[PDB]
Amino acid sequence: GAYNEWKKALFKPADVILDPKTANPILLVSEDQRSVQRAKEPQDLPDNPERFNWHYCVLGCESFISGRHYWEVEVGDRKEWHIGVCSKNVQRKGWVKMTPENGFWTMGLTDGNKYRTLTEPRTNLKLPKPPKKVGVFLDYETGDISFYNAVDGSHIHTFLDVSFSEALYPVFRILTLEPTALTICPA
Ligand SMILES: CC/C(=C\COP(=O)(O)OP(=O)(O)O)CO
Numbered sequence: 001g002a003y004n005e006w007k008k009a010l011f012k013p014a015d016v017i018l019d020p021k022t023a024n025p026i027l028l029v030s031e032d033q034r035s036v037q038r039a040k041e042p043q044d045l046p047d048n049p050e051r052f053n054w055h056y057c058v059l060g061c062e063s064f065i066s067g068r069h070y071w072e073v074e075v076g077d078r079k080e081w082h083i084g085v086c087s088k089n090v091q092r093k094g095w096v097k098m099t100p101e102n103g104f105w106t107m108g109l110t111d112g113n114k115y116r117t118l119t120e121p122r123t124n125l126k127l128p129k130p131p132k133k134v135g136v137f138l139d140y141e142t143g144d145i146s147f148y149n150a151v152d153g154s155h156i157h158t159f160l161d162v163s164f165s166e167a168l169y170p171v172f173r174i175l176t177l178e179p180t181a182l183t184i185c186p187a
Contacts, residue, residue, distance in 0.1 A: 003153030060170035082108030
């Protein structure tokens with residue numbers, strides 16, 4: 001459909017690989033650096049400055065300061081996940097609420113069937129069909145971060161007209177231990 005035919009004409013396909021130095025110690029990044037899973041217990045890793053030490057998050061290796069970019073994530077039948085972008089200077093040590101005011105523009109799924117925007121306060125989304133693949137779209141200059149169902153092209157949510165000042169990284173968060181990973185679709 002138009003989603004597949006047009007996405008690369010309008011947004012540059014990012015090749016997103018997960019950065020293991022950023023991943024909370026309870027997360028596992030695959031060898032190909034496209035998938036993340038959770039362990040039962042935190043692994044023994046350094047508490048280096050880049051690492052999220054409280055939130056179960058991991059970033060992409062590359063950030064954006066301009067332009068239009070997109071990537072796609074296979075959420076599959078996971079019951080819990082949140083994805084989007086965050087500022088380079090978010091608080092990585094200790095808790096902060098993941099909200100736009102704190103430098104996070106994310107949405108996702110909790111409890112199998114509760115889709116939300118991670119706004120302050122959180123807002124519930126009503127999705128007619130559960131997505132299996134989500135496209136994440138950034139237009140830095142217009143300030144828009146949009147999410148689409150990458151199979152049928154349907155709109156999930158847009159953060160509109162944000163005045164970004166920092167570099168933005170792709171961010172991914174998983175809280176649950178489940179058989180299916182969260183995986184980036186390769187460009
Ligand atoms: C502490 C458990 C955690 C995320 C949950 O953060 P919290 O602010 O409680 O909830 P949401 O962001 O609304 O899901 C680890 O990333």
